[PDB]
Amino acid sequence: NPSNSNLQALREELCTPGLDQGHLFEGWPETVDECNERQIALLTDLYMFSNMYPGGVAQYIRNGHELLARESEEVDFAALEMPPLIFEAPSLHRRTAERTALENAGTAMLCKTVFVLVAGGLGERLGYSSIKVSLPVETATNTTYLAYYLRWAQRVGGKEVPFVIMTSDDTHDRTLQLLRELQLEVPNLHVLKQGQVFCFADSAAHLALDETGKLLRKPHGHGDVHSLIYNATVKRDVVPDSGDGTATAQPLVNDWLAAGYESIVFIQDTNAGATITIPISLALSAEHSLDMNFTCIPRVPKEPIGLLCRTKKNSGDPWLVANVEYNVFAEVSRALNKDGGDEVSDPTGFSPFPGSVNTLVFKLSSYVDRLRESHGIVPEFINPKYSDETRRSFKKPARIESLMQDIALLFSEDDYRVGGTVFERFSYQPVKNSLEEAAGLVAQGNGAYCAATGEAAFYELQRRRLKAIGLPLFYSSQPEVTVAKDAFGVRLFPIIVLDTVCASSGSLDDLARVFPTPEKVHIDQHSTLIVEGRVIIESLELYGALTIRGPTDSMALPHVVRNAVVRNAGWSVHAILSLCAGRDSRLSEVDRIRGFVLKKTAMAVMDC
Ligand SMILES: O=c1ccn([C@@H]2O[C@H](COP(=O)(O)OP(=O)(O)O[C@H]3O[C@H](CO)[C@@H](O)[C@H](O)[C@H]3O)[C@@H](O)[C@H]2O)c(=O)[nH]1
């Protein structure tokens, strides 16, 4: 496609005033026909950047200039208030009539929901060299986040549930490898890889080169999903899929709407609470006719999560319900000395506005309308990392970024209802920080949000849900293992893990189908109970570790467990000692990032 004439034209265009990329061509011959392979390759990289970015490298440089201009200024909002449409979600551990009605409504709507997972990000910050969706949700069964999300979606929306995964050059191959290794067969899964974008060596938007004289590339952010969704097409067989000149053959959102789907949900890579959040949010979206629903928790003022606010950036601008990122809100709080009030905004211990968890719930029709109008394009930003305190020198080359929640900026208050649902903080269980960062954050009285806290929170969530339906679990709240040089402790036991065949959607009703007489099931605080397949447990006395396996098919007749008594050594947990020799280390980085290992000393199995 790119001829030598067009490559020379682009080179001349990029050397013009306002673009000033002549440093890319130092010592090069005048003509393209006289240039060698590495130069042709660099011009071709510049030329075909236009395929993945609107307007190509020249428009990328102009946008960079606009964004670095905007970033040099102190951000100001004309008006910043509580969103009009805020709704308080009921407790996930209380089986109230409202909770039952919302869970059942949400579970019904999950049959008509599209799921999107943003998994383009690296997790090297954790000390984990592999992809984040490969992390286990818990080490009792070692179920990956990828498997957890896909199996839950296929359980609530059938085998042919529409599922989208955004990948990157860093995660794509390994994501597909994991799908193969887990032997996960998802007929309507679409894996869309986001393209990296060029970087700016300086504040004048001069394109950066790497160590080998090639154009440095960096992620454009999780805002890439919408455009990736907008340009996505599908083709099957014996179906009316006309190849339009836009692309062959049919737009993917067209196939969704034609199939009868009514909602779309966006989730992130390492937050299991989404399976508890999504159904309630969906029900509340239907009850209050929300076009877009932000999943929110009460925010502590020192928290690396954004805040959902009603905003007007300029005095003439209309009201916009949108997310303000943590850094921007810190800068805004430092300013506005005479903003109106007596004392600092903290009368309850939490930020005035709720914290956005970035589990987004859209009405599919409204989402498609705004996606078609915007082509998936969302407002961009840039946030360079400077070396000196004031000197405008970049420590690392910078890149334009985007946020997938910023699509809310395309939703006018006149035509659309945009709101937020506030859940308990315990429902937000991400794995974002390493053990060192977690110890540092705990020293300041903040949330760890590490692998050990994520696994412990998963076990506690299962225990709280089961107690909500009357399972009499008596256990201590004292930690059983200290991690990160005795900085903080977590507890894991009792461990109770039910698979998607057993627990179905994970609703309280579905859990009550597994324990129809919960007063006759006595699980000791040190016990482990793994349940796989179609199992019903009527009566059980468990002192140790037990795996109950049932039929892998959901509609198969269930294995019923009555009057069972199991006693064995069961499992323990111990911390990873600093004095570990490291030779014959069966200790992987999965063990090392949580700071403990489970000893599976004994385990009973009931099959059939
Ligand atoms: O180019 C990118 C960058 C990120 N991600 C994914 O985006 C998600 C979130 O990235 P992460 O670095 O964990 O979070 P932030 O982008 O820093 O913060 C987001 O998530 C917070 C909740 O964890 C919210 O409070 C913020 O508003 C929201 O921007 C993860 O699943 C990443 O894999 C991509 O897929 N591609």
- Location of each CATH 3.90.550.10 domain in the chain: 79-427
Element (H, E) at 456: helix 451-468
Ligand 1 centroid, distance to 400 Cα (angstroms): 15
CB of 401 shorter than 6 A to ligand 1: no
| C-alpha pair distances (Å), 115 with each of 5, 172, 278 | 45, 18, 10
Cα gap 403→382, rounded to integer Å: 11
Asked whether the beta carbons of 268 and 454 are under 8 A apart, the reply is no
Q: Tokens for 52, please give them.
A: 């993945």
The helix, strand and coil proportions of the chain, stated in percent and rounded to the nearest 5, come to 30, 20, 45
Q: What is the DSSP string of 173-218?
A: HHHHHHHHHHT---TTEEEEEPPPEE-BSSTT-PBPB-TTSSB-EE
- Location of each CATH 2.160.10.30 domain in the chain: 435-606
What phi and psi, each to the nearest 5 degrees, are found at residue 292? -145, 130
Residue type, 563: N
Element (H, E) at 38: helix 37-48
Name the architecture of domain 79-427. Answer: Alpha-Beta Complex (3.90)
Ligand 1 centroid, distance to 118 Cα (angstroms): 8
Helices (H), 223-307: 225-230, 252-259, 274-287
| C-alpha pair distances (Å), 396 with each of 67, 199, 433, 587 | 17, 9, 21, 33
Return the CATH number of 435-606, one of 3.40.50.170, 3.50.50.60, 3.40.50.300, 2.160.10.30: 2.160.10.30
Q: Tokens for 315, please give them.
A: 């005095």
Asked whether the beta carbons of 560 and 548 are under 8 A apart, the reply is no
If you take atom 13 of ligand 1, which residue's CA is the nearest one? Answer: 432
CB of 356 shorter than 6 A to ligand 1: yes
CB of 118 shorter than 6 A to ligand 1: yes
Q: Tokens for 461, please give them.
A: 């969530």
| C-alpha pair distances (Å), 241 with each of 156, 160, 277, 353, 489 | 28, 19, 36, 46, 57
Ligand 1 centroid, distance to 192 Cα (angstroms): 17
Chain centre to alpha carbon of residue 59 = 29
Asked whether the beta carbons of 217 and 414 are under 8 A apart, the reply is no
Strand spans (E) along 290-374? 292-297, 307-312, 320-324, 355-363
Cα gap 443→243, rounded to integer Å: 59
CB of 323 shorter than 6 A to ligand 1: yes
- The ligand 1 atom at the shortest distance from the C-alpha of residue 220 is 1
User: Binding site for UDP-alpha-D-glucose: what residues are annotated?
Assistant: 118, 120-121, 194, 221-222, 268-269, 306, 325-326, 356, 405, 428, 432
Q: What is the DSSP string of 44-60?
A: HHHHHGGGTSTTHHHHH
User: Binding site for UDP-alpha-D-galactose: what residues are annotated?
Assistant: 118, 120-121, 194, 221-222, 268-269, 306, 325, 356, 405, 432
Cα gap 378→407, rounded to integer Å: 6
Cα gap 62→55, rounded to integer Å: 10
Annotated resolution, angstroms: 2.4
3-state SS track over 89-127: CCCCCCCCHHHHHHHHHHHHHHCCEEEEEECCCCCHHHC
CB of 269 shorter than 6 A to ligand 1: yes
Alpha-carbon radius of gyration of the chain: 26
DSSP class of residue 394 equals: B
Residue type, 248: T
Terminal Cα distance for the chain, rounded: 61
Cα gap 426→428, rounded to integer Å: 5
User: Is the alpha carbon torsion for 563, 569, 570, 573 positive or negative?
Assistant: positive
If you take atom 10 of ligand 1, which residue's CA is the nearest one? Answer: 121
Q: Tokens for 195, please give them.
A: 């393209």
Residue 310 exposure: Cα atoms within 13 Å on the Cβ side = 14
What is the torsion angle, in degrees rounded to the nearest 10, for the CA atoms of residue 375, residue 56, residue 409 and residue 162? 40
CB of 137 shorter than 6 A to ligand 1: no
- The ligand 1 atom at the shortest distance from the C-alpha of residue 167 is 35
Please name the residue that has the structure tokens 């440093």. Answer: 23
Strand spans (E) along 378-427? 380-382, 400-402, 418-422
From 222, 357, 422, mutation site for ligand 1 pocket: most ligand atoms within 8 A of C-beta? 222
What phi and psi, each to the nearest 5 degrees, are found at residue 489? -115, 155
How would you classify residue 337: left for phi > 0, otherwise alpha for psi between -120 and 50, otherwise beta?
A: alpha
Cross-strand partners of 573: 598
CB of 359 shorter than 6 A to ligand 1: no
What phi and psi, each to the nearest 5 degrees, are found at residue 387? -80, -60
Strand-pair category, 564-567 with 380-382: unpaired
In the three-class reduction of DSSP (H, G, I as helix; E, B as strand; rest coil), residue 22 is classed as helix
**36-41, long-range: CB < 8 A, 24+ apart:** 38/213, 40/7
- The ligand 1 atom at the shortest distance from the C-alpha of residue 304 is 25
Ligand 1 centroid, distance to 405 Cα (angstroms): 10
Ligand 1 centroid, distance to 223 Cα (angstroms): 9
Residue 160 exposure: Cα atoms within 13 Å on the Cβ side = 4
Ligand 1 centroid, distance to 408 Cα (angstroms): 16
From 507, 83, 90, select the one nearest 284 (Cα to Cα). Answer: 90
Q: Tokens for 467, please give them.
A: 């107690």
From 118, 165, 265, 270, mutation site for ligand 1 pocket: most ligand atoms within 8 A of C-beta? 118
Please name the residue that has the structure tokens 């997972």. Answer: 117
Cα gap 151→99, rounded to integer Å: 24
Residue type, 211: E
Residue type, 521: V
Q: Tell me how long the chain is.
A: 608
Asked whether the beta carbons of 430 and 229 are under 8 A apart, the reply is no
From 206, 214, 123, 9, select the one nearest 430 (Cα to Cα). Answer: 123
CB of 419 shorter than 6 A to ligand 1: no
Chain centre to alpha carbon of residue 87 = 22
Please name the residue that has the structure tokens 């190849």. Answer: 243
If you take atom 27 of ligand 1, which residue's CA is the nearest one? Answer: 306
In the three-class reduction of DSSP (H, G, I as helix; E, B as strand; rest coil), residue 223 is classed as helix
CB of 358 shorter than 6 A to ligand 1: yes
In the three-class reduction of DSSP (H, G, I as helix; E, B as strand; rest coil), residue 568 is classed as coil
User: Binding site for UTP: what residues are annotated?
Assistant: 118, 120, 132, 194, 269
Sequence-separated (6 or more) residues with CB below 8 Å from residue 463: 473, 475, 494, 496
Ligand 1 centroid, distance to 597 Cα (angstroms): 28
Cα gap 484→119, rounded to integer Å: 27
Sequence-separated (6 or more) residues with CB below 8 Å from residue 473: 463, 466, 467, 494, 496, 523, 525
Ligand 1 centroid, distance to 404 Cα (angstroms): 9
Asked whether the beta carbons of 436 and 575 are under 8 A apart, the reply is no
Asked whether the beta carbons of 82 and 310 are under 8 A apart, the reply is yes
Per-residue b or e along 242-259, where b marks 16 or more CB atoms closer than 10 Å to that residue's CB: eeeeeeebbbbbebbeee
- Helices 435-443, 451-468: axis angle to 10 degrees equals 70
Cα gap 117→321, rounded to integer Å: 23
| C-alpha pair distances (Å), 205 with each of 21, 71, 486, 597 | 9, 13, 46, 48
| C-alpha pair distances (Å), 46 with each of 40, 200, 318, 364, 373 | 10, 14, 38, 36, 28
